[PDB]
Coordinates of N, CA and C in Angstrom, one line a residue:
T1 N 152.4 113.8 182.0 CA 152.5 112.5 181.4 C 151.2 111.7 181.6
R2 N 151.0 110.7 180.8 CA 149.9 109.7 181.1 C 150.3 108.5 181.9
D3 N 151.6 108.5 182.3 CA 152.1 107.4 183.1 C 151.9 107.7 184.6
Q4 N 150.8 107.0 185.2 CA 150.4 107.3 186.6 C 150.8 106.2 187.5
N5 N 151.7 105.2 187.0 CA 152.1 104.1 187.8 C 152.8 104.5 189.1
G6 N 152.6 103.8 190.2 CA 153.4 104.1 191.3 C 152.7 103.9 192.6
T7 N 153.4 104.1 193.7 CA 152.8 104.1 195.0 C 152.8 105.5 195.5
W8 N 151.6 106.1 195.7 CA 151.4 107.5 195.9 C 150.9 107.7 197.3
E9 N 151.5 108.6 198.1 CA 151.1 108.9 199.5 C 150.4 110.2 199.6
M10 N 149.2 110.2 200.3 CA 148.5 111.4 200.3 C 149.2 112.5 201.2
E11 N 149.1 113.7 200.7 CA 149.5 114.9 201.4 C 148.5 116.0 201.3
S12 N 147.3 115.6 200.8 CA 146.2 116.5 200.6 C 144.8 115.9 200.4
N13 N 143.9 116.2 201.3 CA 142.5 115.9 201.2 C 141.6 117.1 201.6
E14 N 141.0 117.7 200.6 CA 140.2 118.8 200.8 C 138.7 118.5 200.5
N15 N 137.8 118.7 201.4 CA 136.4 118.5 201.2 C 135.9 117.1 200.9
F16 N 136.6 116.1 201.4 CA 136.0 114.7 201.3 C 134.7 114.6 202.0
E17 N 134.5 115.4 203.1 CA 133.2 115.5 203.9 C 132.1 116.0 202.9
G18 N 132.4 117.0 202.1 CA 131.3 117.6 201.2 C 131.0 116.6 200.1
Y19 N 132.0 115.9 199.6 CA 131.8 114.9 198.6 C 130.9 113.8 199.2
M20 N 131.3 113.3 200.3 CA 130.5 112.2 201.0 C 129.1 112.7 201.3
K21 N 128.9 113.9 201.7 CA 127.6 114.5 202.0 C 126.8 114.5 200.7
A22 N 127.4 114.9 199.6 CA 126.7 114.8 198.3 C 126.3 113.4 197.9
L23 N 127.0 112.3 198.3 CA 126.6 111.0 198.1 C 125.7 110.4 199.1
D24 N 125.2 111.4 200.0 CA 124.2 111.0 201.1 C 124.7 110.0 202.1
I25 N 126.0 110.1 202.3 CA 126.6 109.2 203.4 C 126.2 109.9 204.8
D26 N 125.8 109.0 205.7 CA 125.5 109.4 207.1 C 126.4 110.3 207.8
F27 N 125.9 111.2 208.6 CA 126.8 112.1 209.4 C 127.7 111.2 210.3
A28 N 127.1 110.2 211.0 CA 127.9 109.3 211.8 C 129.1 108.6 211.0
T29 N 128.8 108.3 209.8 CA 129.8 107.6 209.0 C 130.8 108.7 208.4
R30 N 130.3 109.8 208.0 CA 131.3 110.9 207.6 C 132.3 111.4 208.7
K31 N 131.7 111.6 209.9 CA 132.5 112.1 211.1 C 133.7 111.2 211.4
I32 N 133.6 110.0 210.8 CA 134.6 108.9 211.1 C 135.3 108.3 209.8
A33 N 135.0 108.9 208.6 CA 135.4 108.2 207.4 C 136.5 109.0 206.7
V34 N 136.8 110.2 207.2 CA 137.8 111.0 206.6 C 139.1 110.5 207.0
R35 N 140.0 110.2 206.1 CA 141.4 109.9 206.5 C 142.4 110.8 205.7
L36 N 143.3 111.3 206.4 CA 144.3 112.2 205.7 C 145.6 111.4 205.4
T37 N 145.8 110.2 205.9 CA 146.8 109.3 205.5 C 146.2 108.2 204.6
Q38 N 146.7 108.1 203.4 CA 146.2 107.1 202.5 C 147.3 106.7 201.5
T39 N 147.3 105.5 201.0 CA 148.3 105.2 200.0 C 147.5 104.7 198.8
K40 N 147.8 105.2 197.6 CA 147.2 104.8 196.4 C 148.2 104.1 195.5
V41 N 148.0 102.9 195.2 CA 148.9 102.1 194.4 C 148.3 101.9 193.0
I42 N 148.9 102.3 192.0 CA 148.5 102.2 190.6 C 149.4 101.3 189.9
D43 N 148.9 100.3 189.3 CA 149.6 99.4 188.4 C 149.0 99.6 187.0
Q44 N 149.7 100.3 186.1 CA 149.2 100.6 184.8 C 150.1 100.1 183.7
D45 N 149.5 99.3 182.8 CA 150.2 98.7 181.7 C 149.3 99.0 180.5
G46 N 149.8 100.0 179.7 CA 149.0 100.5 178.6 C 147.7 101.0 179.1
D47 N 146.6 100.5 178.6 CA 145.3 100.8 179.0 C 144.7 100.2 180.3
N48 N 145.4 99.1 180.8 CA 144.9 98.4 181.9 C 145.4 99.0 183.2
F49 N 144.5 99.5 184.0 CA 144.8 100.0 185.3 C 144.3 99.0 186.4
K50 N 145.1 98.8 187.4 CA 144.8 98.1 188.7 C 145.1 99.1 189.8
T51 N 144.1 99.6 190.5 CA 144.4 100.6 191.5 C 143.8 100.1 192.9
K52 N 144.6 100.4 193.9 CA 144.3 100.1 195.3 C 144.5 101.3 196.2
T53 N 143.5 101.9 196.8 CA 143.7 103.1 197.7 C 143.3 102.7 199.0
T54 N 144.3 102.7 199.9 CA 144.1 102.1 201.3 C 144.2 103.2 202.3
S55 N 143.2 103.1 203.3 CA 143.4 103.9 204.5 C 142.8 103.0 205.6
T56 N 142.9 103.5 206.9 CA 142.4 102.6 207.9 C 140.9 102.5 208.0
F57 N 140.2 103.4 207.3 CA 138.8 103.2 207.2 C 138.3 102.2 206.1
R58 N 138.9 102.3 204.9 CA 138.4 101.4 203.8 C 139.5 101.3 202.8
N59 N 139.3 100.2 202.0 CA 140.1 100.0 200.8 C 139.2 100.3 199.6
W60 N 139.5 101.3 198.8 CA 138.9 101.7 197.6 C 139.7 101.1 196.4
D61 N 139.2 99.9 196.0 CA 140.0 99.2 195.0 C 139.1 99.1 193.7
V62 N 139.7 99.5 192.6 CA 139.0 99.4 191.3 C 140.0 99.2 190.2
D63 N 139.7 98.3 189.2 CA 140.4 98.1 188.0 C 139.5 98.5 186.8
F64 N 140.1 98.9 185.8 CA 139.4 99.3 184.6 C 140.4 99.3 183.4
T65 N 139.8 99.3 182.2 CA 140.6 99.5 181.0 C 140.1 100.8 180.4
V66 N 141.1 101.7 180.1 CA 140.8 103.0 179.5 C 140.0 102.6 178.2
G67 N 138.9 103.4 178.0 CA 138.0 103.2 176.9 C 137.1 102.1 176.8
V68 N 137.0 101.3 177.9 CA 136.0 100.3 178.0 C 135.0 100.5 179.1
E69 N 133.7 100.8 178.8 CA 132.7 101.1 179.8 C 132.4 99.8 180.6
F70 N 132.1 100.0 181.9 CA 131.7 98.9 182.7 C 130.7 99.3 183.8
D71 N 129.9 98.3 184.1 CA 128.9 98.4 185.3 C 129.6 98.2 186.6
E72 N 129.5 99.3 187.4 CA 130.2 99.3 188.7 C 129.2 99.4 189.9
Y73 N 129.5 98.7 190.9 CA 128.9 98.9 192.2 C 129.8 99.6 193.1
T74 N 129.4 100.8 193.7 CA 130.3 101.6 194.4 C 130.6 101.1 195.8
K75 N 130.0 100.0 196.1 CA 130.5 99.2 197.3 C 130.3 99.9 198.6
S76 N 131.3 99.9 199.6 CA 131.0 100.4 200.9 C 131.1 101.9 201.0
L77 N 131.3 102.6 199.8 CA 131.3 104.1 199.8 C 129.9 104.5 200.0
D78 N 129.0 104.2 198.9 CA 127.6 104.6 199.0 C 126.7 103.5 198.4
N79 N 127.2 102.4 198.1 CA 126.3 101.2 197.7 C 125.4 101.5 196.5
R80 N 125.9 102.1 195.4 CA 125.2 102.4 194.3 C 125.7 101.8 193.0
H81 N 124.7 101.6 192.0 CA 125.1 101.1 190.7 C 125.4 102.2 189.7
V82 N 126.5 102.2 189.1 CA 126.8 103.1 188.0 C 127.4 102.5 186.7
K83 N 127.3 103.2 185.6 CA 128.0 102.8 184.4 C 129.3 103.7 184.3
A84 N 130.4 103.0 184.6 CA 131.7 103.8 184.6 C 132.5 103.7 183.3
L85 N 133.0 104.9 182.9 CA 133.9 104.9 181.8 C 135.0 105.8 182.1
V86 N 136.2 105.3 181.9 CA 137.4 106.1 182.1 C 138.2 106.3 180.8
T87 N 138.5 107.6 180.5 CA 139.1 108.0 179.2 C 140.1 109.1 179.4
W88 N 140.9 109.3 178.4 CA 141.8 110.4 178.5 C 141.3 111.7 177.9
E89 N 141.4 112.8 178.6 CA 141.3 114.2 177.9 C 142.7 114.8 178.0
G90 N 143.4 114.7 176.9 CA 144.8 115.1 177.1 C 145.6 114.2 178.0
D91 N 146.2 114.7 179.0 CA 146.9 113.8 180.0 C 146.1 113.7 181.3
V92 N 144.9 114.1 181.2 CA 143.9 114.0 182.4 C 143.0 112.7 182.2
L93 N 143.1 111.9 183.3 CA 142.3 110.6 183.2 C 141.0 111.0 183.8
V94 N 139.9 110.8 183.0 CA 138.6 111.2 183.3 C 137.7 110.0 183.5
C95 N 137.1 110.0 184.7 CA 136.1 108.9 185.0 C 134.7 109.6 185.1
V96 N 133.7 109.1 184.3 CA 132.3 109.5 184.5 C 131.6 108.3 185.1
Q97 N 130.9 108.5 186.2 CA 130.1 107.4 186.8 C 128.6 107.8 186.5
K98 N 128.1 107.3 185.4 CA 126.7 107.6 185.0 C 125.6 106.9 185.9
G99 N 124.7 107.6 186.5 CA 123.7 107.0 187.4 C 122.8 108.0 188.1
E100 N 122.3 107.7 189.3 CA 121.4 108.6 190.0 C 121.9 110.0 190.3
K101 N 123.2 110.0 190.6 CA 123.9 111.2 190.9 C 124.5 112.0 189.7
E102 N 124.2 113.3 189.7 CA 124.6 114.2 188.6 C 126.0 114.6 188.9
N103 N 126.8 114.7 187.8 CA 128.1 115.2 187.8 C 129.0 114.3 188.7
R104 N 128.8 113.0 188.6 CA 129.6 112.1 189.4 C 130.7 111.5 188.6
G105 N 131.9 111.6 189.3 CA 133.1 111.0 188.6 C 134.3 111.5 189.3
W106 N 135.4 111.5 188.5 CA 136.6 112.0 189.0 C 137.6 112.3 187.9
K107 N 138.6 113.2 188.1 CA 139.7 113.4 187.1 C 141.0 113.3 187.9
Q108 N 142.0 112.7 187.3 CA 143.2 112.4 187.9 C 144.4 112.6 187.0
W109 N 145.4 113.4 187.5 CA 146.5 113.8 186.6 C 147.7 114.0 187.3
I110 N 148.9 114.0 186.6 CA 150.2 114.2 187.2 C 150.6 115.7 186.9
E111 N 151.1 116.4 187.9 CA 151.6 117.8 187.6 C 152.7 118.0 188.6
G112 N 153.8 118.4 188.0 CA 155.0 118.5 188.8 C 155.4 117.1 189.3
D113 N 155.7 117.0 190.5 CA 156.1 115.7 191.0 C 154.9 114.8 191.4
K114 N 153.6 115.4 191.2 CA 152.5 115.0 192.2 C 151.4 114.4 191.3
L115 N 150.6 113.6 192.1 CA 149.3 113.0 191.6 C 148.1 113.8 192.2
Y116 N 147.2 114.3 191.4 CA 146.1 115.1 191.7 C 144.8 114.3 191.4
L117 N 143.9 114.3 192.3 CA 142.6 113.6 192.1 C 141.5 114.5 192.5
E118 N 140.6 114.8 191.6 CA 139.5 115.6 191.9 C 138.2 114.8 191.8
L119 N 137.5 114.5 192.9 CA 136.3 113.6 192.9 C 135.1 114.6 192.9
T120 N 134.1 114.3 192.1 CA 133.0 115.2 191.9 C 131.7 114.4 192.2
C121 N 130.7 115.1 192.7 CA 129.3 114.6 192.9 C 128.4 115.9 193.0
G122 N 127.5 116.1 192.2 CA 126.6 117.3 192.4 C 127.5 118.5 192.2
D123 N 127.3 119.4 193.2 CA 128.0 120.7 193.3 C 129.3 120.6 194.2
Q124 N 129.7 119.4 194.6 CA 130.8 119.2 195.5 C 132.1 118.7 194.8
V125 N 133.3 119.2 195.1 CA 134.5 118.7 194.6 C 135.4 118.4 195.8
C126 N 135.9 117.2 195.8 CA 137.0 116.8 196.8 C 138.3 116.8 196.0
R127 N 139.3 117.5 196.5 CA 140.6 117.6 195.8 C 141.6 116.9 196.7
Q128 N 142.3 116.0 196.2 CA 143.4 115.3 196.9 C 144.7 115.4 196.1
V129 N 145.7 115.4 196.9 CA 147.1 115.5 196.3 C 148.0 114.4 196.9
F130 N 148.8 113.7 196.1 CA 149.6 112.6 196.5 C 151.0 112.9 196.1
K131 N 152.0 112.4 196.9 CA 153.3 112.5 196.4 C 153.8 111.2 196.0
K132 N 154.8 111.0 195.1 CA 155.2 109.7 194.8 C 156.2 109.2 195.9
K133 N 156.0 108.1 196.4 CA 156.7 107.5 197.5 C 157.2 106.1 197.0

């Protein structure tokens, strides 16, 4: 389905460290930034997404409209400027973050009961899985 609304609780974080290392985040910051407990809240109405992903380390909060490009600052993750565009491929929500980093973005989809998020940078993929709570 393309309906990703809901409050989603993480039950899977694979290779966040490798993703972060691809974004040139400090060892000292990586050794401390991984969280296996997180809540992702998606408020989606048509094309308009409001998303809040909270852990005790940071809040990764971003809003976007599907099919409208926007200039993004990646904030306390890696402090970079990108041109972000989020679209559908089928029922896969695809974000490309165009900038200094190659193959940077993420894809997010529902399968079975679950929300899957694949973050990419360079040769690194972080795979996360959330259950609906």
